[PDB]
Amino acid sequence: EIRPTIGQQMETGDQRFGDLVFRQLAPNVWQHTSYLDMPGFGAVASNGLIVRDGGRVLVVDTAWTDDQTAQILNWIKQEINLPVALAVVTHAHQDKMGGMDALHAAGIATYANALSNQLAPQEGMVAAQHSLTFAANGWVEPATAPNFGPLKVFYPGPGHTSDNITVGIDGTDIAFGGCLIKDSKAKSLGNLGDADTEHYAASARAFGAAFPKASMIVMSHSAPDSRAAITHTARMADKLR
Ligand SMILES: OCc1ccc(-c2cccc(O)c2-c2nnn[nH]2)cc1
Ligand SMILES: [Ca+2]
Ligand SMILES: [Zn+2]
Ligand SMILES: [Zn+2]
Incomplete structure (x- = not known):
C-alpha cells in the first residue's frame, strides 16, 4: 500500500487503482486520491471528487500530474462507463490543476475561477478553458x-x-x-x-x-x-x- 507521509492513509472502503485510491462517499459521489512523491519527504496525498449526474460524470480537481489524471479517467471508464461532461478545478496549484493537459486531451470542458486562470502561468499551471x-x-x-x-x-x-x-x-x-x-x-x-x-x-x-x-x-x-x-x-x- 501507499502510506503517504502527509494526507490520510488507506482504510477499509478504499479501492487502489493504479497509483490512485478511490473511496465511495455516496451512491453518486466518489473521492479520488493521488500522491506526489516529494524529494526527501515521501508521498503527499491530495483529494478530489467524481460525481455521477444521470448519464454523465462531473469531476472536481485534477490529480497532481497528467498521468495520474489520465488514471482517474480510466477508473471512471471502468467503474462508471459514462462520459465526463466537465471538470471544476479549485485553485491554481499543482495538487488541483497539475493534470489539466490530461483533461484537455480527453476533450473534457474545464472550468476554474477567472483569477485561477489568470494566475495559472505564474503558478506553473495550464489554465482551464472556461472562467467562472x-x-x-x-x-x-x-x-x-x-x-x-x-x-x-x-x-x-x-x-x-x-x-x-x-x-x-x-x-x-x-x-x-x-x-x-x-x-x-x-x-x-x-x-x-x-x-x-x-x-x-x-x-x-x-x-x-x-x-x-x-x-x-x-x-x-x-x-x-x-x-x-x-x-x-x-x-x-x-x-x-
Ligand atoms: O498539514 C498537512 C499538509 C501540509 C502541506 C500540504 C501542501 C503541500 C504542498 C503544497 C501545498 O499547497 C500544500 C497545501 N495545500 N493546502 N494547504 N497546504 C498539504 C497538507
Ligand atoms: Ca501538464
Ligand atoms: Zn493550494
Ligand atoms: Zn493543497
Missing part, C-alpha cells in the same frame, strides 16, 4: 457555470490562496472545501506561502455558511470529516489575524 466569475457574496454567476447539475460553486474569499473556490454537491449532504479546509484534528493550516492570513478565518466561516446543512466536509488533504473541520480551521485561522 463570482458575485459580491461569493456565489458563482450562473451564466459562467452552464449545465453544472448538482455542482454549486462558491468563492468564500481569500484563504489558502486568493483564488480558492469550494463546491457543494446538491442532492447530497456533501460539500468540498478543497485546500481551504483542514480536518477537525489538524495541527496546522498547511502551506501558507500563498495564503491571505488576514481573511482566512472569515473565508473558512463563509464556506460553512454557504453550505449550512452539509454534514460531510470533503477536503484536499484529510479524509472526509464533520463540520468541526470548518470550525477548527476557522479557529486556527483566528490566530493568524
Whole structure:
C-alpha cells in the first residue's frame, strides 16, 4: 500500500487503482486520491471528487500530474462507463490543476475561477478553458457555470490562496472545501506561502455558511470529516489575524 507521509492513509472502503485510491462517499459521489512523491519527504496525498449526474460524470480537481489524471479517467471508464461532461478545478496549484493537459486531451470542458486562470502561468499551471466569475457574496454567476447539475460553486474569499473556490454537491449532504479546509484534528493550516492570513478565518466561516446543512466536509488533504473541520480551521485561522 501507499502510506503517504502527509494526507490520510488507506482504510477499509478504499479501492487502489493504479497509483490512485478511490473511496465511495455516496451512491453518486466518489473521492479520488493521488500522491506526489516529494524529494526527501515521501508521498503527499491530495483529494478530489467524481460525481455521477444521470448519464454523465462531473469531476472536481485534477490529480497532481497528467498521468495520474489520465488514471482517474480510466477508473471512471471502468467503474462508471459514462462520459465526463466537465471538470471544476479549485485553485491554481499543482495538487488541483497539475493534470489539466490530461483533461484537455480527453476533450473534457474545464472550468476554474477567472483569477485561477489568470494566475495559472505564474503558478506553473495550464489554465482551464472556461472562467467562472463570482458575485459580491461569493456565489458563482450562473451564466459562467452552464449545465453544472448538482455542482454549486462558491468563492468564500481569500484563504489558502486568493483564488480558492469550494463546491457543494446538491442532492447530497456533501460539500468540498478543497485546500481551504483542514480536518477537525489538524495541527496546522498547511502551506501558507500563498495564503491571505488576514481573511482566512472569515473565508473558512463563509464556506460553512454557504453550505449550512452539509454534514460531510470533503477536503484536499484529510479524509472526509464533520463540520468541526470548518470550525477548527476557522479557529486556527483566528490566530493568524
Ligand atoms: O498539514 C498537512 C499538509 C501540509 C502541506 C500540504 C501542501 C503541500 C504542498 C503544497 C501545498 O499547497 C500544500 C497545501 N495545500 N493546502 N494547504 N497546504 C498539504 C497538507
Ligand atoms: Ca501538464
Ligand atoms: Zn493550494
Ligand atoms: Zn493543497
